[PDB]
Design a protein around this ligand. Structure first.
Ligand code: HEM
Ligand SMILES: O=C(Nc1ccccc1Cl)N(Cc1cccc(O)c1)c1cc(C(F)(F)F)ccc1-n1ccnc1
Length: 453
């Protein structure tokens, strides 16, 4: 019944099976499936995640319209995650008026002025990461980068969302480290075929996030609120002060902190691991970046908000890695009203999809794409890229609100790790075969050789 929609609108696409749509095509992963359909079915195609109609667009003008131009009016919210409970008030999960209220109440928290005042504090746990990196350099055996980066990513997240200056890997007993370190898949794939099961799961009070960690963060936020009763450089602080549009709730503040927590842990650790692999398989970029790191700031010169943005090559290295590996893999907006965007009728309720992975590896906009060529973002070539094709943090008023923070957190960590060690390929795997699941992480871990100086 729903499969004739994209046939009525005259939109090509793989013929879907009843009750399932095109979920069987997800056997090669979201990324492989999106690239294949872009070559065959053209610039715009449509498929079905069960009964949910999905429209893929690649035209940059349509993309701008969906993300920027007609954002508040037609394309505002994302597709329902699933059995989310009290986390429905999360800024990434809120819809329509609650999202506009939450983002305005949280936008000044990620201001360039607020990030500069937290730069010296974000380096205390970073020096602890180098201390834990020298002991691994004493061993000639390779080291998995996801655990070391996650240890740093948890320390910075805890020390920036709250005041817990910790050594996550070296102190594996604090409740803050324990809850975060504990936390496609058979569950998420079933929700796509059965969106009718989403409201039934919430009636069963079974949410996709372990409830044991939610109550632990609820009591932690309660005791931290009692600890406030001169912390002026803290995510929560900035949320409690603005609390005392409408007002921000207490449990609402608990939900957003969990967003800030996870968005800076596996997300940051994943990108940090993708960067170092490409630096290990391309040591000329590693050497030049190490040479450029010592140029703007000599050996044993601490980074600063003004100095990080000066190293031009470090920004080129993070951009190309995000291109080759956009951990989002997709951007989604729900067409909540009948709209004709760029000569195309989009009915209501249709999920409009933007394949970041496919456009990041499209030969039309990138020459030799599968090749890590960080020179694509040089001062003379960074103007040729279309900002609506390379969207690692998305775009529009619902882009990544922590883009500046995540870029600073990773760049501040990269400057200190590269000015003390070098990374050589150990036994790793050049093919770097991506995982076939719903995350843009490698199932095979990232283990390379770390050499000192
Ligand atoms: C390298 C790291 C990161 C990448 C690549 C990234 C990328 C993205 C992307 C692609 C989106 C979707 C935007 C869209 O729908 O168009 C997003 C949303 C979001 N990100 Fe990030 N992100 C990163 C780190 C972070 C961090 C560290 C935080 C906060 C601590 C954060 C907070 C958010 C929030 C709150 C949203 C939802 C925006 C809203 O719905 O208003 N992100 N991010
Ligand atoms: O917000 C988000 N948008 C988004 C981006 C791309 C596709 C779909 C979506 Cl919905 N994601 C999704 C996300 C992003 C990266 C790694 C992940 O594993 C998951 C998010 C969700 C949570 C939650 F649901 F677990 F609470 C926590 C943090 C983030 N997140 C990460 C970076 N920026 C935001």
């Amino acid at each position: 019944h729903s499969h004739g929609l994209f046939k009525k609108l005259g939109i090509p696409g793989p013929t879907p099976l009843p009750f399932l749509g095109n979920i069987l095509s997800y056997h090669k992963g979201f990324c492989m499936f999106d690239m294949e359909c872009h070559k065959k079915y053209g610039k715009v195609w449509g498929f079905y995640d069960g009964q949910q109609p999905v429209l893929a667009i690649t035209d940059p003008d349509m993309i701008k319209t969906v993300l920027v131009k007609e954002c508040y009016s037609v394309f505002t919210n994302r597709r329902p995650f699933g059995p989310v409970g009290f986390m429905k008030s999360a800024i990434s999960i809120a819809e329509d008026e609650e999202w506009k209220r939450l983002r305005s109440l949280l936008s000044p928290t990620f201001t360039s002025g607020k990030l500069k005042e937290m730069v010296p504090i974000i380096a205390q746990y970073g020096d602890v990461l180098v201390r834990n990196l020298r002991r691994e350099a004493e061993t000639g055996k390779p080291v998995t980068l996801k655990d070391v980066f996650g240890a740093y990513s948890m320390d910075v997240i805890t020390s920036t969302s709250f005041g817990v200056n910790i050594d996550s890997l070296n102190n594996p007993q604090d409740p803050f480290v324990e809850n975060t370190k504990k936390l496609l898949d058979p569950f998420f794939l079933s929700i796509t075929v059965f969106p009718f099961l989403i409201p039934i799961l919430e009636v069963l009070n079974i949410c996709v996030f372990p409830r044991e960690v939610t109550n632990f963060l609820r009591k932690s936020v309660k005791r931290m609120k009692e600890s406030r009763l001169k912390h002026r450089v803290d995510f929560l602080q900035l949320m409690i002060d603005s609390q005392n549009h409408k007002a921000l709730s207490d449990l609402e503040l608990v939900a957003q902190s969990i967003i800030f927590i996870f968005a800076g842990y596996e997300t940051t650790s994943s990108v940090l691991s993708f960067i170092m692999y490409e630096l290990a398989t391309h040591p000329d970029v590693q050497q030049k970046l190490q040479e450029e790191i010592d140029a703007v700031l000599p050996n044993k010169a601490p980074p600063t908000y003004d100095t990080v943005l000066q190293m031009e090559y470090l920004d080129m290295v993070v951009n190309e890695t995000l291109r080759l590996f956009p951990i989002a893999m997709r951007l989604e907006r729900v067409c909540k009203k009948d709209v004709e965007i760029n000569g195309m009728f989009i009915p209501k309720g249709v999920v409009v999809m933007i394949p970041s992975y496919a456009l990041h590896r499209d030969p039309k906009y990138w020459t030799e794409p599968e090749k890590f060529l960080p020179e694509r973002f040089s001062k003379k070539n960074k103007d040729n890229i279309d900002p609506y094709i390379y969207t690692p943090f998305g775009s529009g008023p619902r882009n990544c609100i922590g883009m500046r923070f995540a870029l600073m957190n990773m760049k501040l960590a990269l400057i200190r790790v590269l000015q003390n060690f070098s990374f050589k390929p150990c036994k790793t795997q050049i093919p770097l075969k991506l995982s076939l699941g719903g995350l843009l992480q490698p199932e095979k871990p990232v283990v390379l050789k770390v050499e000192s100086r």
